[PDB]
Design a protein around this ligand. Structure first.
Ligand SMILES: [Mg+2]
Length: 758
RNA sequence: UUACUGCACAGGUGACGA
DNA sequence: TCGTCACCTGTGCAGAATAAC
């Protein structure tokens, strides 16, 4: 019935007396906050400076003496609450402001976990994992039209390596190549320094340096990355350190699992409620009841969308609630019409892996048999094909080759394809040592580039994957198979939809930011994905091939007007039919581009039809989480009383935060991985205020459905494919643009229907 | 680069205003 | 060209046999 938040009501005064000055130049703000510090809280907003006296005593300030009512303009006290919260907890130092973020004072989980696993070492004490809390004052709407201010509590972990580098070398750890950051960060300065090349002195030489190429061991520390944690801890504890890691894992679950997260939030609120918070020398705020999402009173703030249906035919008849159960039963959605029932697949691999590749190939095509029910039938039978012909392309290359692997792959491919006929896809096997080389010598991107130029999509695979034990291999081959079929132009499945309106187009934009290393400046690229309403089905449209970030707003416009025009011809809209267009991205569009897009789409479809348009952003990293106390979770393992997903809301729960925003739960207990998996964070779905379509509950459920549309895997994706696919297109095309002999000519010819980006 | 999930660190960035 | 609110993207590691069943 009810969903509990991680936030607390804040009781504020109805009203606060203020002094206002017009200050059209906001540069002035800096100095004025200083001149009046301590006596005045100061705030700029729409051309005016607002002054809230906090302590008696000059300096005095001029301006109009206006009252500000909290119900009408809650931004004022919300901002003041950022500062007030810090001052209410003066024993807890801010490591970050707005939101106020601070460290637990006693608990330190590496010590705790070493003790708990029975481990010790003289440098452990310099490895620290400390709980970090943030208190975020946010405006929300308990019912439509009335605003309130809540305080939302979030929990993470500071990882830090405070050990001096002299010790870590002397203890047996190769520092070479690790990233190094400033111990003491310079006022609004960069922290990262570079990577350690060597040490011959108290100063260390750097490569991939951000500043000067030298700094003192006492100005520098390792960054608190996991990489540096495991590299350092394996080379001081191993191979026993895995016992530490899971011990550490056990400790953090003590702050992040549902019940334990709910408890820490409760205790934070009890602490914050003990006194009143001092907004000013005689005005008080009071932290109150835990905020809830419910349908009690006049509130209609929680709902549960129905389960998504994976659908495998166009009459609606062949549906399932899980993609893979649906695929095995029915075979793929487009099986009746699928054109090429005998595909020829190039398989490019190091000659010395031959036997391993043949067994992976045999399992993929013909299956693993009934002892491995995850992948019994194999690709040909799973997808309803006649057969699959493999064209073997061994490459005489060794994992130690670091400079010429790519040219050897590309020469082998070229010489093999010149005799042979047409191949319809390829499989490229990569050595793990080659997978992450720089792109100028990386065989993943060069073989991808060569084969895409020729109109051949590829499914690549790293040797550690080819060698997976059978219990995992079966799942690997489910995803491998779904993406290969899609790259052969197949459609594995759709998700259900009942059209209220005569046509619905969703288009999404994604971003990728590319650089050779953490020093070089990242270059932005974009991708565009389209999805169409069908008869009971969401259908994946075509996909961008141009990827430059400069001008992306015009590219959104062209793809929409072009698709609308084509949809009108196909479907032959009647006078009075309603067309709906939805846009998806991880960031909001500018108002001016919304206006430009509405205008062009409105003109394109013309006056015979009604057009509805909605502009949506999907956020993952916000201060909101949802707790379902009625949820006991699931049994994790055999002989395991321990549970997973305890308090996790169900997949499809949609909570109202305000008029334009919903919280969307995607990871149910069924999908949560492990007993120690944190309480999941829901997606935040936000509607652009200039949208002409306003039903964000519907848009929240549409985004949910689009997570189930991913053909990269049998399991749902963490964001709708409108965005996800586009990010994958953007990164690929971005990388390919710099590869010699890359050409996009075939992306709209041979690859027009290929899901080559999966 | 089979993926899902999680976390960490780093870089910063976006939208709205005058 | 600043204030203010907000959180995005890249990378690397690991999974109480990781894989909705
Ligand atoms: Mg892929």
């Amino acid at each position: 019935r009810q969903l509990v938040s991680n936030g607390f009501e804040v009781n504020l005064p109805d009203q606060v007396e203020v002094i206002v000055r017009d200050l059209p130049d906001p540069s002035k703000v800096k100095e004025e906050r200083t001149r009046l510090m301590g006596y005045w809280f100061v705030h700029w907003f729409d051309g005016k400076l607002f002054h809230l006296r906090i302590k008696a005593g000059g300096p005095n300030v001029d301006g109009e003496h206006r009252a500000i009512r909290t119900a009408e303009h809650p931004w004022l006290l919300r901002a003041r609450l950022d500062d007030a919260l810090e001052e209410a907890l003066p024993k807890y130092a801010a490591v970050k402001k707005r939101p106020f973020t601070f460290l637990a004072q006693k608990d330190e989980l590496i010590d705790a976990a070493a003790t708990a696993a029975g481990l010790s070492h003289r440098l452990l004490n310099s490895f620290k994992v400390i709980p970090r809390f943030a208190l975020s004052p946010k405006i929300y709407e308990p019912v439509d039209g009335t605003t309130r201010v809540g305080v939302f509590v979030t929990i993470g972990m500071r990882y830090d390596i405070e050990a001096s580098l002299r010790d870590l070398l002397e203890a047996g750890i190769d520092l070479r190549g690790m990233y190094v950051v400033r111990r003491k960060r310079q006022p609004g300065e960069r922290g990262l320094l570079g990577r350690v090349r060597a040490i011959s002195d108290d100063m260390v030489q750097l490569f991939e340096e951000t500043d000067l190429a030298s700094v003192n061991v006492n100005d520098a520390k390792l960054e608190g990355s996991k990489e540096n944690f495991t590299r350092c801890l394996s080379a001081l504890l191993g191979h026993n350190y895995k016992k530490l890691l899971n011990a550490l894992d056990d400790q953090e679950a003590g702050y992040r699992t549902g019940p334990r997260f709910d408890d820490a939030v409760r205790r934070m609120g009890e602490f914050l409620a003990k006194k009143p918070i001092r907004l000013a020398d005689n005005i008080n705020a009071q932290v109150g009841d835990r905020i809830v999402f419910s349908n009690e009173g006049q509130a209609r703030n929680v709902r549960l969308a129905p389960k998504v249906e994976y659908v495998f035919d166009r009459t609606g008849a062949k549906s399932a609630e899980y993609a893979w159960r649906g695929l095995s039963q029915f075979g793929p959605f487009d099986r009746p019409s699928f054109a090429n029932r005998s595909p020829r697949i190039l398989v490019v691999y190091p000659s010395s892996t031959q036997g391993k590749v043949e067994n992976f190939l045999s399992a993929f095509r013909d299956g693993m048999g009934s002892n491995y029910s995850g992948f019994s039938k194999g690709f040909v039978d799973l997808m309803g094909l006649t057969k699959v012909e493999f064209v073997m392309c061994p490459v005489e290359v060794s994992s130690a080759d670091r400079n010429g692997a790519h040219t050897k792959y590309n020469s082998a491919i070229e010489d093999k394809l010149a005799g042979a006929g047409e191949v319809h896809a390829g499989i490229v096997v990569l050595f793990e040592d080659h997978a992450r080389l720089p792109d100028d010598r990386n065989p993943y991107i060069h073989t991808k580039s060569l084969l895409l130029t020729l109109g051949v999509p590829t499914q690549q695979v790293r040797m550690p994957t080819v060698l997976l034990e059978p219990k995992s291999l079966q799942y690997t081959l489910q995803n491998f198979s779904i993406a290969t079929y899609a790259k052969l132009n197949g459609t594995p499945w759709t998700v259900n939809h009942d059209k209220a309106i005569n046509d619905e187009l969703v288009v999404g934009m994604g971003l990728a930011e590319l650089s050779g290393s953490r020093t070089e400046k990242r270059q932005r690229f974009v991708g565009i994905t389209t999805v169409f309403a069908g008869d009971g089905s969401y259908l994946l449209g075509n996909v961008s091939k141009e990827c430059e970030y400069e001008g992306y707003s015009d590219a959104i416009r062209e793809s929409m007007t072009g698709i609308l025009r084509e949809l009108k011809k196909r479907n032959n809209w009647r006078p009075g039919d309603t067309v709906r267009v939805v846009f998806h991205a991880h960031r909001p569009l500018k108002r001016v581009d919304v206006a430009s897009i509405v205008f062009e789409c409105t003109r394109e479809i013309g006056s015979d039809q009604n057009i509805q348009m909605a502009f949506v952003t999907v956020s993952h990293d916000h201060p909101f989480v949802l707790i379902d106390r009625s949820e006991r979770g699931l049994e994790a393992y055999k002989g395991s009383t321990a549970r997973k997903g305890v308090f996790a809301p169900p997949r499809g729960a949609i909570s109202r935060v305000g008029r334009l925003t919903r919280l969307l739960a995607v990871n149910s207990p069924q999908l949560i991985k492990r007993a120690n998996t944190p309480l999941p964070t829901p997606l935040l779905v936000s509607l652009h205020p200039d949208s002409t379509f306003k039903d964000v509950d519907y848009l929240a459920e549409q985004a949910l459905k689009f997570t189930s549309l991913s053909w990269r895997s049998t399991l749902p994706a963490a964001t709708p494919v409108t965005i996800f696919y586009s990010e994958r297109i953007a990164e690929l095309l971005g990388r390919l643009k710099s590869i010699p002999n890359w050409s996009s000519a075939n992306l709209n010819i041979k690859l027009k229907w290929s899901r080559w980006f999966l």
